[PDB]
From a paper:
Further classification of the extended state reveals [name] to be more heterogenous beyond NBD1, which suggests that NBD1 is more stably bound to components of its own protomer. In the contracted state, the flexible arms of [name] extend from the interface between the DUF domain of [name] and the cytosolic domain of inner [name].
Specialized protein transport systems—known as type [name] secretion systems (T7SSs)—are central to the virulence of this pathogen, and are also crucial for nutrient and metabolite transport across the mycobacterial cell envelope.
Numbering used by the authors:
A (entry chain D7): 19 to 130
B (entry chain C1): 1 to 29, 97 to 274, 285 to 416
C (entry chain D8): 18 to 118
Protein backbone atom coordinates (compact mmCIF):
# COMPACT_ATOMS: atom_id res chain seq x y z
CA UNK A 1 0.00 0.00 0.00
CA UNK A 2 1.24 3.49 -0.85
CA UNK A 3 0.12 7.05 -1.45
CA UNK A 4 1.65 9.94 -3.35
CA UNK A 5 1.58 13.65 -2.52
CA UNK A 6 3.23 16.91 -3.33
CA UNK A 7 5.37 17.61 -0.26
CA UNK A 8 6.17 21.30 -0.32
CA UNK A 9 9.52 22.48 0.99
CA UNK A 10 11.55 25.64 1.29
CA UNK A 11 10.30 28.88 -0.25
CA UNK A 12 7.70 26.89 -2.22
CA UNK A 13 9.56 24.16 -4.12
CA UNK A 14 7.02 21.57 -5.15
CA UNK A 15 8.41 18.10 -4.58
CA UNK A 16 6.56 14.83 -5.10
CA UNK A 17 7.08 11.88 -2.76
CA UNK A 18 6.03 8.27 -2.20
CA UNK A 19 4.82 7.50 1.35
CA UNK A 20 3.41 4.48 3.16
CA UNK A 21 -0.34 4.12 3.63
CA UNK A 22 -0.73 2.68 7.14
CA UNK A 23 2.28 3.63 9.29
CA UNK A 24 1.54 6.77 11.34
CA UNK A 25 2.85 10.24 10.57
CA UNK A 26 5.37 10.39 13.43
CA UNK A 27 7.25 7.24 12.37
CA UNK A 28 7.97 8.70 8.90
CA UNK A 29 8.40 12.47 9.40
CA UNK A 30 12.10 12.05 10.26
CA UNK A 31 13.30 10.06 7.19
CA UNK A 32 11.13 12.02 4.75
CA UNK A 33 13.10 15.10 5.86
CA UNK A 34 16.33 13.52 4.56
CA UNK A 35 15.08 12.92 0.98
CA UNK A 36 13.53 16.39 0.74
CA UNK A 37 16.95 17.71 1.89
CA UNK A 38 18.90 15.38 -0.44
CA UNK A 39 16.88 16.69 -3.41
CA UNK A 40 16.92 20.34 -2.31
CA UNK A 41 20.71 20.57 -2.85
CA UNK A 42 20.39 19.32 -6.46
CA UNK A 43 18.06 22.19 -7.29
CA UNK A 44 20.66 24.29 -5.48
CA UNK A 45 18.34 25.15 -2.61
CA UNK A 46 19.42 25.20 1.01
CA UNK A 47 18.15 22.23 3.06
CA UNK A 48 15.43 22.94 5.61
CA UNK A 49 16.93 24.78 8.59
CA UNK A 50 15.62 26.87 11.51
CA UNK A 51 16.47 27.58 15.16
CA UNK A 52 14.66 27.66 18.49
CA UNK A 53 12.98 25.04 20.67
CA UNK A 54 10.64 23.01 18.50
CA UNK A 55 10.50 20.55 15.64
CA UNK A 56 9.49 19.57 12.10
CA UNK A 57 6.16 18.01 11.18
CA UNK A 58 3.70 17.63 8.29
CA UNK A 59 0.91 20.19 7.85
CA UNK A 60 -2.18 21.16 5.88
CA UNK A 61 -2.31 24.46 4.00
CA UNK A 62 -3.76 26.46 6.92
CA UNK A 63 -0.92 25.58 9.30
CA UNK A 64 -2.74 22.77 11.07
CA UNK A 65 -0.38 19.90 11.93
CA UNK A 66 -1.68 16.40 11.34
CA UNK A 67 -2.27 13.83 14.06
CA UNK A 68 1.01 12.22 15.07
CA UNK A 69 -0.37 8.74 15.87
CA UNK A 70 -2.54 7.71 12.88
CA UNK A 71 -2.20 6.49 9.31
CA UNK A 72 -2.48 8.94 6.44
CA UNK A 73 -5.31 6.51 5.58
CA UNK A 74 -6.99 7.32 8.90
CA UNK A 75 -6.83 10.95 8.13
CA UNK A 76 -8.16 11.53 4.57
CA UNK A 77 -5.01 11.60 2.43
CA UNK A 78 -5.20 10.07 -1.07
CA UNK A 79 -3.10 10.22 -4.22
CA UNK A 80 -2.34 13.72 -5.48
CA UNK A 81 -2.85 15.65 -2.23
CA UNK A 82 -0.52 18.48 -1.19
CA UNK A 83 1.13 18.94 2.23
CA UNK A 84 3.67 21.23 3.92
CA UNK A 85 6.78 20.55 6.01
CA UNK A 86 6.97 23.31 8.61
CA UNK A 87 8.81 24.53 11.74
CA UNK A 88 6.63 24.42 14.88
CA UNK A 89 8.31 26.64 17.45
CA UNK A 90 7.28 26.50 21.11
CA UNK A 91 5.61 29.91 20.73
CA UNK A 92 2.99 28.48 18.31
CA UNK A 93 -0.67 29.05 19.32
CA UNK A 94 -3.56 28.88 16.80
CA UNK A 95 -6.91 30.71 16.60
CA UNK A 96 -9.39 27.86 15.94
CA UNK A 97 -12.27 30.45 16.16
CA UNK A 98 -14.78 30.70 13.25
CA UNK A 99 -17.53 33.30 12.71
CA UNK A 100 -20.64 33.73 10.52
CA UNK A 101 -21.56 36.78 8.42
CA UNK A 102 -23.12 37.22 4.98
CA UNK A 103 -20.30 36.76 2.50
CA UNK A 104 -22.27 39.02 0.11
CA UNK A 105 -22.08 42.09 2.41
CA UNK A 106 -18.44 41.91 3.51
CA UNK A 107 -17.24 41.80 -0.09
CA UNK A 108 -19.56 44.66 -1.08
CA UNK A 109 -18.83 46.74 2.06
CA UNK A 110 -15.23 46.96 0.83
CA UNK A 111 -16.59 49.33 -1.85
CA UNK A 112 -20.06 50.37 -0.60
CA UNK B 1 -4.56 4.81 -2.69
CA UNK B 2 -7.60 5.93 -4.67
CA UNK B 3 -11.24 6.81 -4.20
CA UNK B 4 -13.82 4.63 -5.90
CA UNK B 5 -16.02 6.07 -8.63
CA UNK B 6 -19.16 4.50 -10.14
CA UNK B 7 -20.52 6.28 -13.24
CA UNK B 8 -24.30 6.89 -13.40
CA UNK B 9 -26.66 6.75 -16.30
CA UNK B 10 -25.69 9.85 -18.31
CA UNK B 11 -27.45 13.14 -17.72
CA UNK B 12 -29.73 13.99 -20.67
CA UNK B 13 -28.02 16.17 -23.32
CA UNK B 14 -29.72 19.32 -24.67
CA UNK B 15 -31.58 18.23 -27.82
CA UNK B 16 -30.73 19.75 -31.25
CA UNK B 17 -33.71 20.67 -33.45
CA UNK B 18 -33.40 20.53 -37.27
CA UNK B 19 -35.14 22.95 -39.62
CA UNK B 20 -36.05 22.26 -43.27
CA UNK B 21 -36.57 25.75 -44.70
CA UNK B 22 -37.53 26.88 -48.23
CA UNK B 23 -36.19 30.32 -49.06
CA UNK B 24 -37.99 33.52 -50.06
CA UNK B 25 -38.18 33.54 -53.87
CA UNK B 26 -36.95 36.99 -54.98
CA UNK B 27 -39.00 39.79 -56.45
CA UNK B 28 -38.98 39.79 -60.26
CA UNK B 29 -38.82 43.08 -62.15
CA UNK B 30 -43.56 53.02 -56.87
CA UNK B 31 -45.65 53.27 -53.67
CA UNK B 32 -46.70 49.64 -54.22
CA UNK B 33 -43.22 48.16 -54.78
CA UNK B 34 -41.79 49.34 -51.45
CA UNK B 35 -44.62 47.47 -49.70
CA UNK B 36 -43.57 44.43 -51.74
CA UNK B 37 -39.88 44.94 -50.84
CA UNK B 38 -40.61 45.63 -47.14
CA UNK B 39 -42.68 42.46 -46.79
CA UNK B 40 -39.88 40.38 -48.33
CA UNK B 41 -37.35 41.69 -45.79
CA UNK B 42 -39.66 40.82 -42.86
CA UNK B 43 -40.26 37.25 -44.01
CA UNK B 44 -36.45 36.99 -44.12
CA UNK B 45 -36.01 38.10 -40.49
CA UNK B 46 -38.46 35.40 -39.39
CA UNK B 47 -36.23 32.83 -41.12
CA UNK B 48 -33.31 34.43 -39.26
CA UNK B 49 -35.07 33.89 -35.92
CA UNK B 50 -35.71 30.29 -36.98
CA UNK B 51 -31.98 29.97 -37.76
CA UNK B 52 -30.75 31.64 -34.54
CA UNK B 53 -32.89 29.34 -32.37
CA UNK B 54 -31.62 26.19 -34.12
CA UNK B 55 -28.05 27.51 -33.83
CA UNK B 56 -28.52 27.99 -30.07
CA UNK B 57 -29.54 24.34 -29.70
CA UNK B 58 -26.26 23.29 -31.39
CA UNK B 59 -24.08 25.56 -29.22
CA UNK B 60 -25.64 24.12 -26.07
CA UNK B 61 -25.23 20.55 -27.37
CA UNK B 62 -21.56 20.82 -28.43
CA UNK B 63 -20.31 22.78 -25.39
CA UNK B 64 -22.11 20.29 -23.15
CA UNK B 65 -19.95 17.54 -24.72
CA UNK B 66 -16.65 19.47 -25.29
CA UNK B 67 -15.82 22.08 -22.62
CA UNK B 68 -12.93 24.51 -22.53
CA UNK B 69 -9.83 22.81 -21.09
CA UNK B 70 -9.38 25.08 -18.03
CA UNK B 71 -12.87 24.27 -16.74
CA UNK B 72 -12.11 20.54 -16.67
CA UNK B 73 -10.50 20.46 -13.22
CA UNK B 74 -13.46 21.87 -11.27
CA UNK B 75 -15.71 19.34 -13.04
CA UNK B 76 -13.41 16.49 -12.11
CA UNK B 77 -15.51 14.65 -9.54
CA UNK B 78 -18.90 15.10 -11.17
CA UNK B 79 -20.76 12.44 -13.23
CA UNK B 80 -19.83 14.45 -16.33
CA UNK B 81 -16.40 12.81 -15.86
CA UNK B 82 -15.62 9.58 -17.79
CA UNK B 83 -19.03 9.86 -19.47
CA UNK B 84 -18.25 8.86 -23.07
CA UNK B 85 -19.17 5.37 -24.31
CA UNK B 86 -17.92 3.14 -27.16
CA UNK B 87 -21.17 1.29 -27.91
CA UNK B 88 -22.18 2.46 -31.35
CA UNK B 89 -24.74 5.13 -30.63
CA UNK B 90 -22.35 7.66 -29.06
CA UNK B 91 -21.15 9.87 -31.91
CA UNK B 92 -18.45 11.61 -29.81
CA UNK B 93 -16.27 8.63 -28.92
CA UNK B 94 -12.80 9.28 -30.29
CA UNK B 95 -13.60 12.97 -30.88
CA UNK B 96 -11.42 15.58 -29.17
CA UNK B 97 -11.65 19.36 -28.96
CA UNK B 98 -8.67 21.05 -30.61
CA UNK B 99 -9.94 24.62 -30.51
CA UNK B 100 -12.77 26.84 -31.71
CA UNK B 101 -13.89 27.68 -35.22
CA UNK B 102 -16.61 27.49 -37.87
CA UNK B 103 -19.24 24.81 -38.42
CA UNK B 104 -22.28 24.46 -40.76
CA UNK B 105 -25.77 24.80 -39.22
CA UNK B 106 -28.42 22.09 -38.96
CA UNK B 107 -30.71 24.15 -41.18
CA UNK B 108 -31.00 22.66 -44.68
CA UNK B 109 -32.00 25.41 -47.12
CA UNK B 110 -34.21 24.81 -50.17
CA UNK B 111 -33.37 26.81 -53.29
CA UNK B 112 -35.93 29.49 -54.25
CA UNK B 113 -38.18 28.07 -56.95
CA UNK B 114 -38.85 30.05 -60.16
CA UNK B 115 -35.63 32.04 -59.79
CA UNK B 116 -35.75 35.09 -62.13
CA UNK B 117 -33.08 35.17 -64.83
CA UNK B 118 -30.01 37.28 -64.05
CA UNK B 119 -31.31 40.31 -65.96
CA UNK B 120 -34.76 40.05 -64.31
CA UNK B 121 -33.74 40.07 -60.60
CA UNK B 122 -34.63 43.11 -58.48
CA UNK B 123 -31.65 44.92 -56.86
CA UNK B 124 -32.47 45.04 -53.11
CA UNK B 125 -33.82 41.54 -52.54
CA UNK B 126 -31.09 40.13 -54.80
CA UNK B 127 -28.11 41.11 -52.65
CA UNK B 128 -30.02 40.53 -49.39
CA UNK B 129 -30.83 36.90 -50.24
CA UNK B 130 -27.20 36.41 -51.37
CA UNK B 131 -25.50 37.64 -48.17
CA UNK B 132 -27.98 35.72 -46.02
CA UNK B 133 -26.83 32.51 -47.69
CA UNK B 134 -23.14 33.49 -47.39
CA UNK B 135 -23.18 34.25 -43.63
CA UNK B 136 -26.14 32.28 -42.26
CA UNK B 137 -24.61 29.16 -43.83
CA UNK B 138 -22.08 28.99 -40.97
CA UNK B 139 -22.09 29.52 -37.19
CA UNK B 140 -18.96 31.01 -35.63
CA UNK B 141 -17.08 29.85 -32.50
CA UNK B 142 -18.09 26.27 -31.98
CA UNK B 143 -15.65 23.65 -30.60
CA UNK B 144 -13.69 22.26 -33.55
CA UNK B 145 -12.61 18.64 -33.37
CA UNK B 146 -10.40 15.84 -34.68
CA UNK B 147 -11.32 12.16 -34.88
CA UNK B 148 -8.81 9.51 -33.87
CA UNK B 149 -10.73 6.89 -35.87
CA UNK B 150 -10.41 8.65 -39.25
CA UNK B 151 -6.67 8.93 -39.93
CA UNK B 152 -3.47 7.05 -39.05
CA UNK B 153 -1.63 10.14 -37.79
CA UNK B 154 -1.69 13.93 -37.54
CA UNK B 155 1.59 15.74 -38.15
CA UNK B 156 1.92 18.77 -35.88
CA UNK B 157 4.23 21.32 -37.50
CA UNK B 158 5.38 24.47 -35.74
CA UNK B 159 7.51 26.03 -33.06
CA UNK B 160 7.88 24.10 -29.83
CA UNK B 161 5.81 26.31 -27.49
CA UNK B 162 2.80 25.92 -29.80
CA UNK B 163 3.09 22.21 -30.59
CA UNK B 164 3.48 21.38 -26.89
CA UNK B 165 0.69 23.80 -26.00
CA UNK B 166 -1.77 21.95 -28.24
CA UNK B 167 -0.55 18.46 -27.33
CA UNK B 168 -1.15 18.85 -23.57
CA UNK B 169 -4.63 20.33 -24.19
CA UNK B 170 -5.46 17.24 -26.28
CA UNK B 171 -4.08 14.87 -23.63
CA UNK B 172 -6.17 16.23 -20.73
CA UNK B 173 -9.37 16.48 -22.82
CA UNK B 174 -9.02 12.78 -23.59
CA UNK B 175 -8.23 12.19 -19.92
CA UNK B 176 -11.28 14.05 -18.60
CA UNK B 177 -13.81 12.85 -21.16
CA UNK B 178 -12.72 9.26 -21.83
CA UNK B 179 -11.98 6.63 -19.22
CA UNK B 180 -8.73 4.73 -18.81
CA UNK B 181 -10.26 1.48 -20.15
CA UNK B 182 -11.07 3.27 -23.42
CA UNK B 183 -7.95 5.41 -24.01
CA UNK B 184 -4.30 4.55 -23.25
CA UNK B 185 -1.39 6.92 -23.93
CA UNK B 186 2.36 6.60 -24.65
CA UNK B 187 5.25 9.05 -25.11
CA UNK B 188 8.52 8.34 -26.86
CA UNK B 189 10.60 11.47 -26.14
CA UNK B 190 14.11 12.74 -25.44
CA UNK B 191 13.00 15.84 -23.42
CA UNK B 192 11.87 13.89 -20.36
CA UNK B 193 11.90 17.33 -18.65
CA UNK B 194 8.61 18.07 -20.46
CA UNK B 195 6.87 14.73 -19.69
CA UNK B 196 7.35 14.78 -15.88
CA UNK B 197 3.81 16.11 -15.17
CA UNK B 198 2.48 12.94 -16.85
CA UNK B 199 3.58 10.88 -13.82
CA UNK B 200 0.18 11.33 -12.19
CA UNK B 201 -2.50 10.56 -14.82
CA UNK B 202 -4.03 7.04 -14.77
CA UNK B 203 -4.39 6.89 -18.59
CA UNK B 204 -0.58 6.81 -18.81
CA UNK B 205 -0.60 3.56 -16.83
CA UNK B 206 -1.01 0.06 -18.16
CA UNK B 207 -2.12 -3.47 -17.38
CA UNK B 208 5.47 4.52 -19.75
CA UNK B 209 7.42 7.51 -20.99
CA UNK B 210 10.19 6.13 -23.20
CA UNK B 211 13.53 7.51 -24.30
CA UNK B 212 14.19 6.23 -27.85
CA UNK B 213 12.64 4.06 -30.53
CA UNK B 214 14.92 1.13 -29.78
CA UNK B 215 13.50 1.15 -26.24
CA UNK B 216 9.85 1.54 -27.27
CA UNK B 217 10.34 -1.25 -29.81
CA UNK B 218 11.19 -3.76 -27.07
CA UNK B 219 8.45 -3.13 -24.51
CA UNK B 220 5.56 -1.43 -26.33
CA UNK B 221 6.03 -2.40 -29.99
CA UNK B 222 6.16 -6.07 -28.99
CA UNK B 223 2.49 -5.55 -28.13
CA UNK B 224 1.64 -2.93 -30.79
CA UNK B 225 3.41 -4.51 -33.77
CA UNK B 226 1.20 -7.55 -33.25
CA UNK B 227 -1.35 -6.84 -36.01
CA UNK B 228 -3.07 -4.78 -38.63
CA UNK B 229 -3.03 -1.66 -40.76
CA UNK B 230 -5.20 1.41 -40.45
CA UNK B 231 -8.88 1.13 -41.38
CA UNK B 232 -11.03 4.28 -41.02
CA UNK B 233 -14.03 3.57 -38.75
CA UNK B 234 -17.12 5.54 -37.71
CA UNK B 235 -19.47 5.75 -34.73
CA UNK B 236 -21.47 2.66 -35.71
CA UNK B 237 -18.23 0.73 -36.34
CA UNK B 238 -17.02 1.74 -32.85
CA UNK B 239 -19.03 -1.09 -31.28
CA UNK B 240 -16.63 -3.67 -32.79
CA UNK B 241 -13.09 -2.31 -32.15
CA UNK B 242 -11.42 -3.65 -28.96
CA UNK B 243 -11.77 -1.33 -26.05
CA UNK B 244 -8.46 0.53 -25.51
CA UNK B 245 -7.59 2.99 -28.23
CA UNK B 246 -3.88 3.84 -28.10
CA UNK B 247 -2.55 7.34 -28.70
CA UNK B 248 1.22 7.37 -29.29
CA UNK B 249 3.33 10.55 -29.30
CA UNK B 250 6.60 10.57 -31.29
CA UNK B 251 9.02 13.31 -30.21
CA UNK B 252 12.53 12.01 -31.05
CA UNK B 253 13.23 12.27 -34.85
CA UNK B 254 14.72 8.74 -34.97
CA UNK B 255 14.93 7.16 -38.46
CA UNK B 256 13.86 3.80 -36.92
CA UNK B 257 10.23 5.06 -37.23
CA UNK B 258 10.24 4.27 -40.98
CA UNK B 259 9.01 0.70 -40.38
CA UNK B 260 5.54 1.43 -38.87
CA UNK B 261 4.95 4.62 -40.92
CA UNK B 262 5.70 3.39 -44.44
CA UNK B 263 3.63 0.30 -43.56
CA UNK B 264 0.53 2.53 -43.10
CA UNK B 265 0.18 2.00 -39.33
CA UNK B 266 -1.84 -0.50 -37.31
CA UNK B 267 -5.41 -0.49 -36.10
CA UNK B 268 -5.77 0.60 -32.48
CA UNK B 269 -3.17 3.40 -32.66
CA UNK B 270 -2.85 7.05 -33.61
CA UNK B 271 0.35 9.07 -33.89
CA UNK B 272 1.09 12.73 -33.46
CA UNK B 273 4.51 13.71 -34.74
CA UNK B 274 5.78 16.59 -32.61
CA UNK B 275 9.04 16.91 -34.61
CA UNK B 276 8.01 17.56 -38.21
CA UNK B 277 10.11 14.76 -39.71
CA UNK B 278 9.71 14.28 -43.45
CA UNK B 279 8.34 10.73 -43.25
CA UNK B 280 5.19 12.04 -41.47
CA UNK B 281 4.73 15.43 -43.20
CA UNK B 282 4.26 14.25 -46.83
CA UNK B 283 0.43 13.89 -46.81
CA UNK B 284 -1.82 17.01 -46.72
CA UNK B 285 -4.89 15.00 -45.60
CA UNK B 286 -2.91 14.22 -42.42
CA UNK B 287 -1.16 17.52 -41.58
CA UNK B 288 -1.93 20.33 -39.13
CA UNK B 289 0.07 23.49 -39.87
CA UNK B 290 0.47 26.26 -37.27
CA UNK B 291 0.63 29.96 -38.01
CA UNK B 292 2.70 31.97 -35.55
CA UNK B 293 -0.61 33.07 -33.93
CA UNK B 294 -1.58 29.45 -33.26
CA UNK B 295 -4.14 29.21 -36.07
CA UNK B 296 -4.13 25.64 -37.39
CA UNK B 297 -4.81 24.73 -41.03
CA UNK B 298 -5.80 21.39 -42.53
CA UNK B 299 -7.97 20.01 -45.32
CA UNK B 300 -11.72 20.50 -44.85
CA UNK B 301 -13.70 17.54 -43.53
CA UNK B 302 -17.43 16.78 -43.47
CA UNK B 303 -19.44 17.59 -40.34
CA UNK B 304 -21.29 14.26 -40.35
CA UNK B 305 -18.78 11.77 -41.82
CA UNK B 306 -15.36 13.51 -41.46
CA UNK B 307 -14.64 12.58 -45.09
CA UNK B 308 -12.38 14.96 -47.00
CA UNK B 309 -14.25 17.32 -49.33
CA UNK B 310 -11.37 19.30 -50.87
CA UNK B 311 -7.65 19.05 -51.67
CA UNK B 312 -6.73 22.66 -50.75
CA UNK B 313 -5.82 23.38 -47.10
CA UNK B 314 -7.79 26.04 -45.25
CA UNK B 315 -8.60 27.47 -41.79
CA UNK B 316 -9.45 24.87 -39.14
CA UNK B 317 -9.12 25.94 -35.47
CA UNK B 318 -7.71 28.55 -33.11
CA UNK B 319 -5.67 26.47 -30.65
CA UNK B 320 -6.33 26.33 -26.91
CA UNK B 321 -3.35 25.27 -24.81
CA UNK B 322 -2.24 24.44 -21.25
CA UNK B 323 1.10 24.89 -19.43
CA UNK B 324 3.10 22.18 -17.62
CA UNK B 325 1.85 23.60 -14.30
CA UNK B 326 -1.84 23.56 -15.29
CA UNK B 327 -1.46 20.06 -16.69
CA UNK B 328 0.04 18.79 -13.43
CA UNK B 329 -2.63 20.59 -11.40
CA UNK B 330 -5.31 18.77 -13.43
CA UNK B 331 -3.19 15.59 -13.39
CA UNK B 332 -3.09 15.29 -9.58
CA UNK B 333 -6.85 15.88 -9.18
CA UNK B 334 -7.53 12.99 -11.56
CA UNK B 335 -4.91 10.75 -9.91
CA UNK B 336 -7.27 10.46 -6.92
CA UNK B 337 -9.88 8.25 -8.69
CA UNK B 338 -10.35 4.63 -9.71
CA UNK B 339 -13.06 2.31 -11.03
CA UNK C 1 8.34 35.67 7.17
CA UNK C 2 7.83 32.04 6.17
CA UNK C 3 4.05 32.16 6.78
CA UNK C 4 1.18 34.67 6.83
CA UNK C 5 -2.09 34.49 8.78
CA UNK C 6 -5.25 35.46 6.85
CA UNK C 7 -8.99 34.92 7.13
CA UNK C 8 -10.66 32.82 4.44
CA UNK C 9 -14.35 33.30 3.69
CA UNK C 10 -16.32 30.36 2.37
CA UNK C 11 -19.83 29.93 1.03
CA UNK C 12 -22.58 32.06 2.58
CA UNK C 13 -20.25 33.37 5.33
CA UNK C 14 -18.00 31.21 7.58
CA UNK C 15 -14.58 32.80 8.20
CA UNK C 16 -11.68 30.56 9.22
CA UNK C 17 -8.36 32.10 10.24
CA UNK C 18 -5.52 30.37 8.38
CA UNK C 19 -1.68 30.52 8.39
CA UNK C 20 -0.45 30.02 4.79
CA UNK C 21 2.90 29.36 3.10
CA UNK C 22 4.04 32.81 2.01
CA UNK C 23 6.05 31.92 -1.13
CA UNK C 24 4.46 28.98 -2.97
CA UNK C 25 2.27 30.17 -5.86
CA UNK C 26 -1.43 30.49 -5.12
CA UNK C 27 -2.63 27.86 -7.58
CA UNK C 28 -0.75 25.26 -5.53
CA UNK C 29 -3.11 25.91 -2.57
CA UNK C 30 -6.73 26.49 -3.75
CA UNK C 31 -7.63 22.79 -4.05
CA UNK C 32 -6.43 21.50 -0.63
CA UNK C 33 -7.85 24.72 0.86
CA UNK C 34 -11.34 23.76 -0.39
CA UNK C 35 -10.97 20.42 1.38
CA UNK C 36 -10.46 22.13 4.77
CA UNK C 37 -13.36 24.63 4.52
CA UNK C 38 -15.66 21.75 3.57
CA UNK C 39 -14.45 19.47 6.39
CA UNK C 40 -15.15 22.24 8.92
CA UNK C 41 -18.60 23.22 7.56
CA UNK C 42 -19.72 19.58 7.55
CA UNK C 43 -19.08 19.15 11.29
CA UNK C 44 -20.46 22.61 12.13
CA UNK C 45 -23.77 21.48 10.55
CA UNK C 46 -23.79 23.70 7.45
CA UNK C 47 -24.25 22.75 3.78
CA UNK C 48 -20.97 22.40 1.82
CA UNK C 49 -19.73 24.32 -1.20
CA UNK C 50 -20.37 22.86 -4.67
CA UNK C 51 -19.84 23.46 -8.40
CA UNK C 52 -22.54 24.09 -11.02
CA UNK C 53 -21.93 23.05 -14.62
CA UNK C 54 -18.89 24.71 -16.19
CA UNK C 55 -16.45 26.91 -14.30
CA UNK C 56 -13.38 27.04 -12.09
CA UNK C 57 -12.44 27.53 -8.43
CA UNK C 58 -10.55 30.70 -7.59
CA UNK C 59 -9.04 32.21 -4.46
CA UNK C 60 -9.78 35.92 -4.50
CA UNK C 61 -9.45 39.08 -2.51
CA UNK C 62 -12.48 40.14 -0.52
CA UNK C 63 -13.10 42.47 -3.48
CA UNK C 64 -13.77 39.37 -5.59
CA UNK C 65 -10.88 39.94 -8.02
CA UNK C 66 -8.84 36.71 -8.21
CA UNK C 67 -5.11 36.55 -7.51
CA UNK C 68 -2.65 35.63 -10.25
CA UNK C 69 -2.46 31.83 -10.14
CA UNK C 70 1.27 31.70 -10.97
CA UNK C 71 2.78 34.17 -8.46
CA UNK C 72 3.85 33.66 -4.84
CA UNK C 73 1.68 34.87 -1.97
CA UNK C 74 4.59 37.12 -0.89
CA UNK C 75 4.97 38.36 -4.47
CA UNK C 76 1.38 39.48 -4.26
CA UNK C 77 0.76 42.15 -1.61
CA UNK C 78 -0.99 39.84 0.87
CA UNK C 79 0.08 40.39 4.48
CA UNK C 80 -0.56 38.72 7.81
CA UNK C 81 -4.00 39.84 8.94
CA UNK C 82 -5.59 40.17 5.50
CA UNK C 83 -8.50 37.95 4.42
CA UNK C 84 -9.38 35.95 1.31
CA UNK C 85 -12.31 34.25 -0.44
CA UNK C 86 -12.66 30.77 -2.00
CA UNK C 87 -15.16 31.00 -4.85
CA UNK C 88 -16.64 29.40 -7.98
CA UNK C 89 -16.53 31.53 -11.17
CA UNK C 90 -18.63 30.38 -14.17
CA UNK C 91 -17.54 29.66 -17.77
CA UNK C 92 -18.30 32.55 -20.19
CA UNK C 93 -17.58 30.79 -23.55
CA UNK C 94 -20.51 30.81 -26.02
CA UNK C 95 -21.27 30.99 -29.76
CA UNK C 96 -21.01 34.27 -31.67
CA UNK C 97 -24.15 35.98 -33.03
CA UNK C 98 -24.23 37.68 -36.46
CA UNK C 99 -26.93 39.90 -38.03
CA UNK C 100 -26.39 40.98 -41.62
CA UNK C 101 -28.16 44.31 -42.02
Amino acid sequence: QAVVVGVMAGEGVQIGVLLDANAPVSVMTDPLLKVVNSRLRELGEAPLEATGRGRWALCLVDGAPLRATQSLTEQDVYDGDRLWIRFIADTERRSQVIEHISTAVASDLSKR
Amino acid sequence: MKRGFARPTPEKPPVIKPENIVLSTPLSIRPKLDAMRAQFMLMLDMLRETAQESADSMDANYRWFHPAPNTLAAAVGSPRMWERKPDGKDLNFGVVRVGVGMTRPEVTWGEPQNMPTDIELEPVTGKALQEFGRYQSVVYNLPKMVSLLVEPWYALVGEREQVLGLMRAIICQLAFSHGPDHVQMIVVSSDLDQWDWVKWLPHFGDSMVYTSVREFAAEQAELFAGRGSFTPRHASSSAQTPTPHTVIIADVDDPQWEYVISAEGVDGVTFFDLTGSSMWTDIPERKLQFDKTGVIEALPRDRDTWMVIDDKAWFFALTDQVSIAEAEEFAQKLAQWRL
